[PDB]
Symmetry: C2
Subunit: 80 residues, 2 copies
Amino acid sequence: GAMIIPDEFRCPISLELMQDPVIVSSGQTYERSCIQKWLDSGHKTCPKTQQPLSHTSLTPNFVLKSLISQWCEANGIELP
Amino acid sequence: GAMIIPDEFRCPISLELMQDPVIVSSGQTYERSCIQKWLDSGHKTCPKTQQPLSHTSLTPNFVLKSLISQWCEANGIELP
């Protein structure tokens, strides 16, 4: 293969391969490091979709992680 | 390629293609129909993770949907 990696496996802000991908209540995907900064800043809104967060969720990771593994196995490349 | 559709794309319980995918606060993937039946039964918990639900969030679909589209485009077939 040796082709550009899919955008879904790279966070928009990161613009590179993510290490600890997670999902927010809004359903958007952000890097663990990034979300920590966001929480630290005291932000309670989602800038990507531009909507407020009136609730929290436990959703960490799931299908995306599984799909990444399948992709990695096909390419024979270890995960981040 | 694409000999067989990904397990992730298929519902874990039904094991079939879904038209209205949703994710619980536990980040578990369930079919809209399945969730309605579960709710009708009076159950408000996550059996896969074995934990109760005390809140809700807006997480119907996101990256997962995007990955499906790429998969379908590769096969040149319309979405389920």
